[PDB]
Amino acid sequence: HHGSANKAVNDFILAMNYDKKKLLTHQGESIENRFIKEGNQLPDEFVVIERKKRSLSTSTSDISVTATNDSRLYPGALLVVDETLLENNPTLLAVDRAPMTYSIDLPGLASSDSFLQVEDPSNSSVRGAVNDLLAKWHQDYGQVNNVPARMQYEKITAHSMEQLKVKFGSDFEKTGNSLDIDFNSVHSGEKQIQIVNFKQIYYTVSVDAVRNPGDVFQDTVTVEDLKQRGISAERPLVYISSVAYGRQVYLKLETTSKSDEVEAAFEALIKGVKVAPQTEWKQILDNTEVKAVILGGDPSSGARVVTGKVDMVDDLIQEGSRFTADHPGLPISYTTSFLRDNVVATFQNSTDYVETKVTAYRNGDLLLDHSGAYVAQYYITWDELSYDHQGKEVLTPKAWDRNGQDLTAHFTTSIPLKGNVRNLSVKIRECTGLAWEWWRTVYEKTDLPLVRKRTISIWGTTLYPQVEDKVEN
């Protein structure tokens, strides 16, 4: 502005030519898994894994923040555009700055003096400017009613730690690593997981468009000083054009189960006051469930890692639902704009993942009771399933120990089966003592269904056998 240095600085930037899209793309990896696999052992139920690769490509302009005391995330701030910016750890360009005018969008001022001037932008001045206003709004408002926080929720079922980054931000670890997350237990086919990111905005602070690239500096600054800090074209500049300020929860859910109507549990659980009347399946699921949850927000400092089950008990959802300027909020996300032209910077982050689907097949028992006045015989055959390599399959047949044996009395045994069991046949003859018909076949199903507890129960007399076929799922 007027002085020959600034002007030269202004030319510099304006003249910059570069690829806004080839600079804001970060990458992880791909390597192809052929599909294949399948096949798995068990404990108290038998699964088939099978891992079918998939592809995550996000692009936003809003950047999640999992900091609090991050001194370089203030609106106005210039960031360099280089590898560290993609990773959410940007090289800050402190350099003598000119003043700025920020807007602020909460209710109680609409236009009148919902504006602010700062002489030297910095985390401090800009905070202390804000925190001044948040008083005279508490002094007019906040205590007017519940000024309510604008919520915004997102989900992803897990699959890998990196693929999570591409959903929640190039900086997830210091949150990930904290929620205790076991994928060794989901490429096994054991656990299955989903992760929520609840956001609660109280207010937002933003910057009108910079009319000239020079305008952001002071006349003390030269191009030489910018070159000396590595700005190029190759490494241009953005400015933090907006910041939203509030509370955040990241939150991870894991269950024993594998019901292919599990997702449904959550979505309706999340909706809060949506108890279901016990008994249910979209309620058994939740009762075998264990959380871990991080709060960045409301009482400023660091994070609150916390766990509980749900039993709805963890409803911190509406914890910070009301604003009112008691304690301000911390910064949750921000936006950047190139200085050259005020174009919002838009980051395209991609990776493809190790995607592992799972499938049911519980395992019950078959129980026999013989309380008949006669002799009987069981022929009980089946096929035990597995997958070796390529998967394909492996049906090695099998057969009860007492096939053939004559059983009397009151005989009971419980033959237990597992999920891979298939082609289960069961035959039962009783013996009549009639010369022309030695045996009645009294029961004979092929491909019995596999159930928690089938119990076949034969009784009665030689000429008048009774049979109960009882399933119990």
Author numbering: -2 to 470
Please quote the paper that reports this structure.
Pneumolysin (PLY), a major virulence factor of the bacterium, is a pore-forming toxin belonging to the family of cholesterol-dependent cytolysins (CDCs). PLY is produced as a water-soluble monomer and recognises mammalian cells via its C-terminal domain (domain 4) before assembling into circular prepores of ~30–50 monomers on the surface of cholesterol-rich membranes. The monomers in the prepore undergo critical structural changes, including the unfurling of two alpha helical bundles (α-HB1 and α-HB2) in domain 3 in each monomer that are then refolded into β-hairpins (transmembrane hairpins TMH1 and TMH2) for insertion into the membrane, which is facilitated by a structural collapse towards the membrane surface. The resultant PLY β-barrel pore has a diameter of ~300 Å that causes lysis of the target cell.
A significant difference, not observed in any of the published CDC structures, is the high mobility of regions of two strands (residues 29 to 35, 46 to 50) in D2. Consequently, the hydrogen bond interactions that D2 forms with both D3 and D4 that are typically observed in SLY and other CDCs are absent in PLY. Two gold cyanide compounds, used to improve the quality of the crystals, are bound to Cys 428. In one site the gold complex packs against Trp 435 and Trp 436 and the other packs against Tyr 461 from a symmetry related molecule. The Trp-rich loop in PLY D4 (residues 427 to 437) adopts the same conformation as that previously seen in SLY and SLO, despite the binding of the gold complex to Cys 428. The buried surface between PLY subunits is extensive, with more than 1500 Å2 buried in the interface (750 Å2 from one monomer and 770 Å2 from the second). Thus it seems the linear oligomers observed in the ILY, LLO and PLY structures are glimpses of the very early stages of weaker monomer-monomer interactions required before the interactions become strong enough to drive the conformational changes needed to induce circularisation of the oligomer.
